[PDB]
Amino acid sequence: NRPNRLIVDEAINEDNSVVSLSQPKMDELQLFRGDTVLLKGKKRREAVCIVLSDDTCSDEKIRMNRVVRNNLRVRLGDVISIQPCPDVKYGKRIHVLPIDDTVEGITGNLFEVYLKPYFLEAYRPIRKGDIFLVRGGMRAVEFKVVETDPSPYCIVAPDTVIHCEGEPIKREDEEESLNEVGYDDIGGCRKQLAQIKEMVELPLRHPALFKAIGVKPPRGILLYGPPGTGKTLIARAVANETGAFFFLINGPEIMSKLAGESESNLRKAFEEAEKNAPAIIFIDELDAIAPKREKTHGEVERRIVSQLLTLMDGLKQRAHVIVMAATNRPNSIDPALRRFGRFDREVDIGIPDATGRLEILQIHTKNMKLADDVDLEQVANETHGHVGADLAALCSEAALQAIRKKMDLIDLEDETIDAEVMNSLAVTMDDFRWALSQSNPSALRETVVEVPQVTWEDIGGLEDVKRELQELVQYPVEHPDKFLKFGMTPSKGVLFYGPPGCGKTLLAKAIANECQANAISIKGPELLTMWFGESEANVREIFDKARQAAPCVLFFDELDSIAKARGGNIGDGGGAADRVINQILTEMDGMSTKKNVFIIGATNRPDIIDPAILRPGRLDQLIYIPLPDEKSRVAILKANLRKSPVAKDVDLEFLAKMTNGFSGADLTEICQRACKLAIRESIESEIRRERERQTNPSAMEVEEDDPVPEIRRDHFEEAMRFARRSVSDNDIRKYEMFAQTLQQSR
Amino acid sequence: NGPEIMSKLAGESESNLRKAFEEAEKNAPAIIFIDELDAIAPKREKTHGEVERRIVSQLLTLMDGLKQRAHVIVMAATNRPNSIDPALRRFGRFDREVDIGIPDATGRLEILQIHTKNMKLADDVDLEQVANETHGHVGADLAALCSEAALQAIRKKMDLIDLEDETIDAEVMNSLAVTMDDFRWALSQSNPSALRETVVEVPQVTWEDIGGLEDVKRELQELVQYPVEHPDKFLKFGMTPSKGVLFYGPPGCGKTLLAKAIANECQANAISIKGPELLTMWFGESEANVREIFDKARQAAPCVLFFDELDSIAKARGGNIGDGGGAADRVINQILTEMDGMSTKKNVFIIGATNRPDIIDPAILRPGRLDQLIYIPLPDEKSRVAILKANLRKSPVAKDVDLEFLAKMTNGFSGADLTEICQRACKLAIRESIESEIRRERERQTNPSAMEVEEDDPVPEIRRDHFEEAMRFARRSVSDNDIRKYEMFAQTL
């Protein structure tokens, strides 16, 4: 609704000093011809200069020299706030000096060769930060701000004095611009970047609103995650997008000094952060400054921790200075930092997923030409344990594989450096395969909290089970008020029990896929590692990962493992209690019904499990997963076979009726064996064909009609003889006896 | 401030301390406050620097000198009494100790009132529910919650319109109100509860909540109410009141509820320690923690101490008979050592509970330790009706039900066995309501009727249908053989 809130669009006058008009809008403005109009955009950088060299284009979209997009803006669709401020003072003059492309060739004076013919009767109505193109030649070189005799911008005049003593530089300014791009330079942390925005934008952008009222903003943010996850980059991207000053402090440069100087170095940053407010102070690898008392041995190492704490509390008066720190885990630092007023907030950056990895690949390979057969969707699927930098390395390594393999001797002496070889060259899929398979040792071994991809259709039958799951997990999230109305408290646990390989691990993922919630999976070997290592504290950490990622689902399987280890089913003299389930119960009981955290347990030996875990407020509800029926068997056959060429004379309906009691595991083994037979036959045929005509005196014979394009009935018939049942009737008798003895077993 | 002293050198630190003491003396009557005392004076085992030990002695000398001069008083704040040196806890330096503990529902509500004064609220606040749902939070947490809830609404509106309308003024600034939905969002999303340790407070359960059991109520009031109310009567005669009681019986009969009903009747603090804590102490070989518990009770008098799953340790090692070892362990010995060395005047009562008295060590049943035993039997018909009414006094229900018919239809049941039936019936009703509502909303959306509202709550209350359906799964829990064993133990005495 703001009248001067209008889009900006393409421009044709290669001189940036021109700014457009819109006669219907000029009638709204007081736009006069002369020196300057203040056209205001983002980040406070403007393009202020002479005006009215337009009205060639339509209205509602001001024509502004495209070079004032990288500056003052980012892209199209933006909006300008054009308001005249002509008649600026006439100081001495504005700086003259190039930046990047002038040292390349004759330099002379850098003013009187190429730039002099442009400050003619248009004597630079400008604003420091306006960047453009001006030359007396190839017509592509920048003109940047270096000096400022008058603080506000002016209109130059002859007879002045200029010193091109300055030297053209690198893209310090371009790096600053890349940082300014910010949100469009990262991927895989969509949630974590939205939480920060809503947390810091309001204090920084409109501090007056917070001044007018008494409310408490944040003064400490802590980001913990594995290395190489783009944390300092996030801080720079957030500081630049809001225009707030950014100061960087690193740990090693504070612990590599002498005592007094080291302490005093930490007080200059705060002093050079309050005189540039609103500003941000960023400290990385805080673990190198303030670790726990276990790793803090020495007196001077404590004089530097108390100094930091007393400095943090000196900001309660000032609400426009914010501190963000980075580390790996939160328990690696003194808890005194984690307090109310020092580092209250927390953020888990985490690890990207297929979508985030694909986004990172896209950004990293933007200028990297890729000819063909580069999907980048597959690549994101085989990268399990890669973070940030690693992918970048990948993108470089493959590129090297492109040139190192064949350009090894071509580029030695035949030619000098040229672009027709660099641009003409491309990157293929084989380079990516060699780079990923050969020299990519992932640096990750931690747990993963992300939504899976398994859908309901992958599982067969069990409609009642799915209905029950929806009633338990899905209903409360949508109708909390209905649950409250009847004075009800929903359950927070469920236990699966049944024979092995009947489809219990898939349900925990399908439910999360439908609910759009993260899931965490824990195996029995981890529980045995805790039992033998006698480290039950890790359990707390596990639950901590189920509290900061809500809503989510927590899955425990092979729960009987510990009860199996010590003696048989009954075990040794000792009862059914141990030192690892006690902690699980303790953590379960000390948890609120809110936060939407669900827990699922799986096992195949219900009898041995501690009866104290099925009390109310614990895994109260029990579900019996049975062996699939013939109709379910054909469903599982279709599910497994859908992702292979398996058109055949035989029919899966024929196979299912022959099977009797086959578990789901057996039905994912027939296909594997049949495909193995088919691929062996194909390989043998290929080798014999490739060998015969060349070993024979036949120079050239061509025939490639695929001998094995699909899985035929013969392969399935051969495979059917190599597979049988993998369970005994006695187990089914035990399961049904337990399913009935629950009658009055409470 | 502790760190401000540790962030300097010896001369500067031990000059500021002295100067502060002189300044406090000059402006008498004055007060000195110290925080983060652990950062200054922890136990010597954790101190290595010679300067660190040279900064504690100065404080001791100043504290000793204070007694001679002026009216200055000194107050210090610490996280736990044991975290600091024991030389400060003497006669003349820090003789007096105090605990702050944690606020209760009333305290949380009061803090919300304090922090909501100048803020504008709607009619949907109902801070009582928030206080009930606010478990573990403290004052800072509540202030943060209030600020976050305000910022939710403020950021929603501000980001939407008035960035361009006009320079924000007081009228629009204060025009905005707050709604309970923002509170619920701030509570569910931001829930960094900073409390996971023990708790001490007066419970809310009352005798009316319990079903029947009048004789045990009479037998309980005599043990607790009479000594506190009438000591001179005991003094006139020669008896000294006992300080322990043990409940033995089958599970699901309300043993846990009596220990809190007594406290609610007498308005006394209550503490409950569960069996998992005992097993955690056993495996960790940490019997010292026990002592701390009693100290808390000693400082929370009048109070009641509760222990359940007391037979858990004996069950763990071997079965009822156990392994080769006897009936003793590492924790019960400490409990006896603490009980024997306790004064009667502190009026700290002790309650234990179990369902397998056969394997409890007899040493705890000796005179002076849990000498009075009470048996909690299975609820009867007249009791069962009361339990049903008590559990159903919170939910809306129809009138076709025949509660007495259900009560008589049940035999050998437990209190929980009826609460589970009520929960199952409520689940059936909620599922029916959800299905009906979703089907209704889905059917007419295809029919483009702008106005079609036959709004009737499909099933406000439940009938005999759901209760009889749940009766199919409603079945006995405790075996008759177990009841016979309990009776045999109750007769062989």
Ligand SMILES: Nc1ncnc2c1ncn2[C@@H]1O[C@H](COP(=O)(O)OP(=O)(O)O)[C@@H](O)[C@H]1O
């Ligand atoms: N209903 C089913 N649909 C599809 N696959 C199944 C089904 N039941 C079992 N499976 C197969 O069994 C494997 C998973 O076994 P799982 O059920 O986790 O064993 P357990 O029950 O011992 O945990 C999967 O590879 C899957 O192919």
Ligand SMILES: Nc1ncnc2c1ncn2[C@@H]1O[C@H](COP(=O)(O)OP(=O)(O)O)[C@@H](O)[C@H]1O
């Ligand atoms: N006499 C009773 N009056 C009210 N509720 C009861 C009664 N007996 C059992 N309950 C129900 O049982 C549940 C708690 O059982 P509890 O008495 O704690 O087990 P135990 O007796 O094994 O310690 C409560 O939800 C309570 O409503």
